[PDB]
């Protein structure tokens, strides 16, 4: 038995960990399956992709083509359907009809071996007819056979009879494939559309209170949901909603001593009042949480809860399960760290004394919130807990509940970041906030939209409570507008943390990425109604971008993305396509100066020939332009951060 | 079960076809095994390579190191011993001693938790000592334990006792490894040294005749073997030695009709006199061939026979096994082609009517020559026969006779070139003859000495009967000298085709790579005595290069190779190392003009600091130089093609 088959089919992609983990897609998402295919000699090969659903049923006939001359690399686009575990193979074969037609078109006009070449075609078409089940289809091919053999007909007419549309139609439904050779199946995990596509909004329920009761409840925070839904978001991500420890509770601005009424960090989970399966008493009860989830769902909002596998020194686990922590020789537990940052208010979990008990308890907690309608979890710093722990936990949960989505907040080195995605995390936080120049954005999105897309789905949060980038600090509102346009149009999943739309951008100090007076350590009442009346919010732009995404399928996918050259380093241009929908975006990355540039479009990447016009509508303004292969743009910060255009068909 | 283990070990290399085929090595060859290794959290990891012989016996402790900062890619060099099928794994582990030392070096001077830090250190070193055999080593560690616990000494003194060179020494030999996690084994096929290392000489026995009998016999051709052994060659490659067909025999200069005296192409195998298992009657008998083999072996020469799976129209196969050929409807068999080459004198083989019969006959023919002492086969155009056919044939032969070496003469597209090596060909011809500029040579050898070396062993023939490159045509003798130095020092296997040493460089016509009056179609007597006496041969340079290779282990391997920058595009520089042996080569690629340049050596790549001097001997002349990080060279074509230096002491 040989490893290589009769017609070699080699190195099928996408592949993840040599086939030990599945490649990823979502329902309705297209992607390319590729392979190295060739044969000995110079006759033509053909190849096709066989995509099989969870019941083993094959998809449509999906022929591949050589992707670049002389490379022997072949590809075809497939489209994922219903959720579940699929598989794909590549089949390769000798293509005798293509081979013969190429020879006949050369030899017959020159009168070379005319009778022999035509007879080769005749018995070939007889061979193709042998497998054709329909009487009328066979009669079609046999008619071409008889014409090819008709020596009382001019040679050019004998040949032409083999090349009619009616003949092609029979062979398109019953191609003659010789020496068919197949790869061994590769796995594909197809998940729900929200795993790839959605707009996220993060806020702290406790900040949405009243003057008499400053600490918000789930009942008072629910009245923020209409604004979030009106802004076009799909997912509401809440920081931890559990009781918060008192021992070593942090004060305002990340100080080490809480005083008086200080509320502490929600990530310092646990007290005698309860742990990860309980509600902070100041937020209300489990019934109040159910009300919040119900009202969110009525507005089309899904809840994502924070899952932080750690605890305050007051969490019941500390004395119930000491073996879930690392102890020093005096029995004390060192506080958690993530250098240069220190988390003096929490203990990290240790995994090597009782990994089974920890897995059991983790999936118990997840299933509790899942029973209360939470089908999405934002997992904190997963890279400080074992990779195989997450692989086990995610397999357990998705085994019974495949719709649950896990988002990995792993800002770390690339190997870890990729591996967490590959072992099951549906979504990943990314380096987006630290990619701000044209070359940074072009290189990083080229990576994310390329091979990484077979295992990672990016969530572009333009800010988080822990990341206020210097680009926003120094650029002000025009910079918030730019980063919103970029996040919303470069990834099918993007997000903001509350206050982004108010352009809050005061750092803790120069050179920090923390917010001054951070909401992680204090209630932050915001007068949303006043900000809207004073026009100091970019909620309208955010709303518009989410509507554009909902109206243009090209923005609801990741992999089809092309950057078009401009002649100014501050002006970036790119297009995305899905079916007949094309979106073309031009962004001025300079938040301080107007920028003029010529955008030179790669017309064929738009499906257009070089002389065609490009009728576009700028969805930010409603204006129409008659663009072509080279277009002058002028973008003024504070007025026109970008053009977000749909190509008119 | 999870795919990822406790400590992630991912993407172990070398790997061939995802582990379905073995990686390659030869006895005594060192190569790098690498992996992606990291863990959760901030603590240190270590890793090591476990190489196991065919009996499962493990090699020595082989610790790995991170290859570049922040990449999580680790590697170590291993060395293959005896031939057979080996395996290797990577083990990764938590490194608690490195972790503790890092924290102690910070916290002790800071005065943070110093009692706890020192006691954790004492318990850790006690754990490390538990596994140390040898009273001396275990006692050394336990003495550090007791010093760490000695509260009558200052904290800094207690720590310092854990960090002494004598303590490091024990830990380097008995490292304390936690959470040890293994990759799954990967296969390694270790073959005899000649598969990687050897000098090859090709000649036509029939050209080595006498004044009275111009068609050489095996007995007259045996008289050429002493001169071949004297230039330091190890392998003699003969074109086909079988009867030659008469139907469509080619005449001189690749003309289509032979006259009565014309000898034809040796590749047009077969006649009523016999096929692939017979001797051309003008060469003599099988007993004469045995004499030739015996004489070669006495001179230290191995024979490689040409194996051409094809035949003339007169071969016995044509009537005995018609199903081994594709017949057109009129019964004709189209002559072979390798476009744009046409081979009107031969039929190609067809593989799908009787694959078992062809495989049986192929291995029968090989075993016949194998029984007569031929253990190396040069396989013509293997890419025009099925890849899986060669996989089957090579596995059959090497299953009973693992010493047999197959060389693939596949000048074709890269995918096929790579796949043939991967399915078992011990050696491959390469693009060497079409890589002549500095950029071409540097890029191509970086490829061959990199990942490709896990599955392909290059044989650098500087010419063949089918390839007289324009570089040699235009450059004359100084170009022959340059290509000899390059071939002999950049690959552990190189070769020339007879007449190269005479600088034969007249092409068939401008733009051709054929020789005028090619030896493929006519006897080519050469006056070896005259050329030697008149000094118009570069045989002494060839001899010196083979002696240098025999004296310098760095030149008997492939993968250790580094290119050093020069300031002249015509001057290339590179070094190779094997243990303490370092060879440094500087070549002037210009065959017409003297070139002077500064070679700026990457000193750490030579194991030297930037300021040191390196004493070198130019092995081509015996002159000694004192070189450093920057060295002036002046190379005069005709006088000096190159410096081929060894580093002294
Ligand atoms: N990256 C994740 C996990 C981090 C650890 O919880 C969390 O850090 C917050 O919570 C800590 C514990 O309460 C505080 O010590 C800390 O100062 C504060 O910033 C991040 O906000 C969150 O995004
Ligand atoms: N590449 C391999 C195989 C080739 C095909 O056999 C062989 O071609 C030679 O032999 C043919 C058959 O006799 C001739 O028609 C041809 O003109 C001549 O060049 C090559 O020399 C050899 O290196
Ligand atoms: Cl953080
Ligand atoms: Cl050839």
């Amino acid at each position: 038995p040989t490893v290589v088959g009769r017609i070699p089919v080699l190195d099928v992609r996408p592949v993840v960990q040599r086939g030990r983990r599945p490649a990823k897609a979502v329902t309705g998402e297209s992607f390319e399956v590729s392979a190295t295919v060739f044969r000995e000699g110079h006759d033509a090969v053909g190849a096709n992709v066989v995509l099989r659903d969870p019941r083993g049923r094959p998809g449509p006939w999906t022929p591949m083509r050589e992707l670049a001359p002389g490379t022997d690399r072949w590809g075809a686009t497939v489209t994922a359907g219903e959720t579940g575990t699929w598989s794909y193979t590549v089949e390769a074969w000798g293509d005798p009809v293509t081979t013969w037609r190429h020879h006949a078109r050369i030899k017959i006009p020159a009168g070379l071996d005319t009778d022999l070449v035509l007879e080769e075609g005749a018995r070939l078409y007889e061979r193709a007819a042998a497998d054709v089940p329909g009487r009328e289809d066979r009669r079609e091919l046999l008619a071409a056979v008889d014409a090819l053999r008709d020596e009382s007909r001019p040679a050019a007419s004998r040949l032409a009879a083999a090349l009619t549309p009616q003949v092609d139609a029979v062979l398109a439904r019953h191609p003659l494939r010789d020496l068919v050779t197949s790869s061994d199946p590769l796995p594909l995990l197809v998940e729900r559309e929200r795993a790839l596509y959605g707009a996220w909004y993060e806020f702290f329920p406790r900040s949405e209170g009243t003057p008499h009761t400053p600490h918000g409840t789930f009942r008072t925070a629910a009245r923020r949901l209409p604004a979030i839904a009106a802004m076009g978001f799909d997912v509401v991500y809440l920081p931890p909603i559990h009781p918060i420890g008192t021992t070593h509770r942090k004060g305002r601005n990340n100080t080490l001593s809480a005083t008086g009424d200080d509320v502490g960090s929600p990530w310092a989970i646990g007290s005698p009042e309860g742990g990860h399966d309980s509600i902070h008493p100041a937020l209300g009860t489990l019934d109040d949480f159910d009300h919040f989830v119900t009202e969110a769902g009525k507005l089309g909002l899904e809840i994502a809860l924070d899952f932080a596998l750690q605890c305050s020194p007051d969490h019941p686990w500390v004395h119930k399960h000491p073996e879930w922590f690392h102890h020093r020789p005096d029995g004390t537990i060192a506080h958690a760290e993530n250098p240069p940052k220190k988390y003096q208010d929490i203990y990290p979990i240790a995994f090597d004394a009782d990994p089974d008990g920890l897995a059991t308890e983790t999936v118990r907690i997840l299933r509790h919130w899942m029973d209360h309608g939470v089908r999405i979890f934002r997992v904190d710093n997963p890279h400080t807990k074992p990779v195989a722990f997450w692989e086990r936990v995610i397999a357990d949960i998705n085994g019974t509940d495949p719709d649950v989505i896990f988002l990995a907040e792993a800002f770390t080195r690339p190997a870890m970041m990729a591996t967490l995605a590959q072992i099951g995390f549906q979504q990943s936080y990314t380096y987006f906030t630290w990619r701000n120049t044209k070359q940074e954005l072009t290189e990083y999105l080229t990576e994310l939209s390329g091979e990484a897309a077979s295992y990672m789905r990016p969530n572009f949060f333009a800010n988080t409570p822990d990341i206020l980038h210097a680009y926003l600090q120094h650029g002000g509102r025009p910079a918030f507008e730019v980063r919103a346009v970029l996040a919303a149009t470069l990834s099918p999943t993007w997000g903001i943390y509350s206050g982004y739309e108010l352009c809050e951008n005061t750092p803790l100090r120069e050179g920090s990425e923390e917010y001054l007076d951070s909401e992680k350590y204090q209630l932050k009442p915001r007068d949303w109604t006043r900000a809207a009346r004073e026009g100091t919010t970019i909620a309208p732009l955010v709303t518009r971008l989410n509507t554009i995404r909902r109206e243009n399928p090209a923005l609801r996918q990741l992999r089809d993305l092309h950057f078009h050259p401009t002649d100014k380093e501050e002006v970036i241009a790119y297009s995305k396509r899905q079916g007949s929908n094309t979106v073309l975006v031009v962004v001025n990355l300079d938040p301080r100066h107007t920028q003029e540039a010529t955008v030179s479009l790669d017309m064929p990447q738009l499906g257009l020939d070089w002389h065609e016009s490009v009728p576009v509508r700028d969805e930010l303004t409603g204006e129409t332009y008659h663009w072509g292969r080279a277009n002058y743009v002028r973008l003024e910060p504070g007025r026109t951060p970008a053009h977000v255009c749909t190509v008119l068909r």
Side-chain angles (χ1 to χ4, degrees), chain A residues 1-138 140-567 569-591 593-595 597-648:
Chain A
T2 58
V3 168
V4 175
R6 175 66 184 85
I7 307 297
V9 181
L10 308 165
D11 189 19
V12 180
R13 293 186 200 201
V15 60
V16 181
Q17 291 187 26
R18 307 188 183 154
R20 298 198 69 192
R21 291 284 313 157
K24 298 189 191 176
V26 302
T27 297
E29 191 188 5
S30 289
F31 66 95
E32 171 175 272
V33 169
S34 59
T36 291
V37 172
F38 58 83
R39 74 165 297 159
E40 86 291 348
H42 2 82
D43 291 1
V45 300
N48 58 285
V49 180
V50 182
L51 179 61
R52 291 179 188 276
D53 73 7
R55 291 151 50 163
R57 304 182 291 176
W61 173 246
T62 305
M64 336 167 55
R65 77 218 182 266
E66 199 173 26
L67 300 178
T71 63
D72 300 307
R73 193 73 186 169
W74 287 62
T77 301
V78 300
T79 301
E82 80 185 293
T83 60
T85 295
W86 295 53
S87 65
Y88 47 100
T89 56
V90 169
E91 301 176 338
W93 32 279
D95 184 354
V97 171
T98 294
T99 297
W100 172 78
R101 286 182 180 202
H102 174 272
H103 286 323
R105 291 185 146 101
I106 282 167
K107 296 172 192 152
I108 296 307
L112 300 175
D113 299 321
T114 299
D115 289 333
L116 197 59
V117 168
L118 295 173
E119 173 57 25
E120 289 176 319
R123 60 185 63 184
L124 177 59
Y125 278 33
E126 282 179 324
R127 194 157 68 82
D131 296 324
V132 167
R135 180 184 71 65
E136 283 155 89
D137 287 335
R138 290 197 307 276
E140 190 65 44
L141 294 174
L142 289 170
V145 170
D146 289 343
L148 282 161
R149 286 214 179 99
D150 190 356
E151 291 169 46
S152 78
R153 200 145 146 190
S157 300
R158 296 167 70 186
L159 176 54
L163 308 179
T164 71
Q166 300 72 45
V167 163
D168 283 4
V170 177
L171 292 178
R173 272 175 298 110
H174 301 282
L176 178 60
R177 308 182 307 150
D178 289 341
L179 310 174
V180 174
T181 304
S182 173
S183 70
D184 289 326
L186 282 171
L188 175 69
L189 177 58
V190 179
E191 308 191 90
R192 64 184 173 113
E193 179 185 53
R194 182 68 70 240
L196 181 71
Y197 160 76
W200 291 48
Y201 188 83
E202 177 180 5
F203 84 106
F204 291 70
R206 67 184 189 182
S207 287
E208 297 297 329
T210 69
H212 177 247
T213 304
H215 196 293
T217 69
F218 281 118
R219 299 221 159 244
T220 64
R223 290 209 87 88
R224 190 69 189 133
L225 296 168
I228 293 161
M231 262 212 282
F233 290 98
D234 309 294
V235 177
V236 173
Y237 155 44
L238 308 181
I241 61 172
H242 318 297
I244 291 162
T246 51
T247 306
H248 300 297
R249 177 181 288 197
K250 280 178 168 195
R252 298 185 56 241
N253 278 294
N254 201 18
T255 48
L256 294 197
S257 294
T259 66
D261 277 5
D262 274 344
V263 291
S265 165
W267 286 271
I269 295 166
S271 84
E273 307 155 301
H276 292 69
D277 55 5
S278 309
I279 304 290
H280 196 304
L283 293 172
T285 72
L286 193 52
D287 289 338
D288 297 319
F289 179 70
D290 287 340
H291 166 81
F292 187 92
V293 173
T294 292
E295 291 308 308
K298 285 180 184 159
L299 292 160
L301 297 172
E302 298 156 65
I303 300 310
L305 290 190
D306 194 285
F307 180 67
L309 188 43
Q310 66 197 23
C311 62
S312 88
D314 313 308
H315 193 296
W317 288 351
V318 172
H319 72 267
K320 275 193 178 138
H321 305 284
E323 69 280 14
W324 295 355
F325 309 87
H326 303 285
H327 300 251
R328 297 171 308 171
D330 66 352
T332 61
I333 301 155
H335 64 75
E337 280 178 29
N338 204 22
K341 278 169 183 164
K342 294 174 151 51
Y343 309 138
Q344 287 91 341
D345 49 343
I346 54 159
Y347 299 154
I349 297 288
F351 285 83
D352 293 304
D354 182 25
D356 290 342
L358 272 165
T360 298
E361 172 73 1
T362 290
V363 300
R364 181 194 71 84
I365 292 157
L366 295 171
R367 287 198 168 88
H368 169 71
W369 298 114
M370 268 162 60
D371 279 344
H372 289 269
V374 176
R375 319 302 290 185
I376 308 174
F377 295 94
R378 191 268 201 179
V379 181
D380 305 78
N381 291 357
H383 58 294
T384 64
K385 302 82 171 167
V387 174
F389 177 78
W390 296 122
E391 185 179 350
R392 176 176 174 175
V393 160
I394 291 169
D396 184 313
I397 293 290
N398 284 153
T400 56
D401 297 82
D403 67 302
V404 175
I405 291 168
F406 292 92
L407 163 60
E409 185 238 355
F411 297 118
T412 181
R413 301 195 302 276
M416 188 35 101
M417 260 188 101
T419 304
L420 291 167
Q422 290 167 5
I423 56 82
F425 275 94
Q426 281 73 21
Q427 285 188 10
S428 300
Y429 282 82
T430 75
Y431 295 144
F432 177 72
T433 56
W434 306 284
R435 298 289 183 281
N436 294 279
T437 71
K438 175 159 74 179
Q439 162 189 16
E440 286 171 348
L441 288 157
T442 301
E443 290 178 8
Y444 192 48
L445 266 296
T446 296
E447 176 190 328
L448 288 179
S449 66
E451 224 144 49
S454 56
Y455 57 82
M456 175 177 282
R457 304 185 191 100
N459 188 331
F460 279 0
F461 263 90
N463 69 323
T464 82
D466 314 284
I467 308 167
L468 165 68
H469 195 270
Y471 183 81
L472 299 168
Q473 300 175 26
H474 291 154
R477 174 166 175 163
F480 284 83
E481 292 171 356
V482 164
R483 297 305 291 182
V485 173
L486 289 163
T489 58
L490 286 169
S491 175
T493 293
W494 78 298
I496 63 177
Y497 147 60
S498 61
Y500 185 92
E501 66 269 59
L502 306 182
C503 309
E504 294 174 358
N505 73 336
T506 307
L508 174 61
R509 66 178 65 90
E510 193 50 47
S512 174
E513 289 180 346
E514 293 282 313
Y515 287 88
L516 185 62
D517 296 342
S518 163
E519 191 168 14
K520 298 180 288 178
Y521 321 98
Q522 74 185 65
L523 308 181
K524 272 202 109 69
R526 291 170 177 106
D527 193 337
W528 298 105
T529 290
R530 172 163 71 89
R533 291 185 74 71
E534 303 183 352
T536 56
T537 176
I538 61 158
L541 173 63
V542 168
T543 301
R544 193 56 208 150
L545 288 164
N546 280 327
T547 290
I548 293 162
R549 291 157 48 86
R550 291 168 165 194
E551 288 179 354
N552 293 277
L555 295 185
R556 307 208 282 281
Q557 57 82 47
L558 170 66
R559 292 173 216 225
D560 185 285
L561 170 65
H562 180 93
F563 291 94
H564 302 268
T566 87
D567 57 4
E569 202 53 41
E570 300 75 20
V571 177
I572 190 171
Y574 49 91
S575 58
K576 295 172 67 161
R577 304 172 72 197
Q578 164 72 25
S580 72
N581 185 235
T582 298
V583 173
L584 171 61
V585 186
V586 183
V587 190
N588 172 15
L589 307 172
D590 188 342
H593 305 108
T594 296
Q595 296 282 350
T598 303
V599 173
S600 302
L601 298 174
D602 303 315
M603 281 333 257
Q605 297 282 3
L606 298 177
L608 292 180
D609 226 300
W610 291 100
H611 62 93
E612 302 197 67
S613 62
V614 187
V616 295
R617 180 169 83 231
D618 189 354
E619 301 307 298
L620 292 184
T621 62
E623 316 206 329
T624 288
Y625 301 114
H626 199 58
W627 278 358
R629 70 180 289 162
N631 313 286
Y632 166 88
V633 292
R634 172 193 173 81
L635 294 164
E636 310 182 305
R639 298 137 272 181
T640 41
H643 297 295
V644 178
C645 296
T646 56
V647 177
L648 288 208

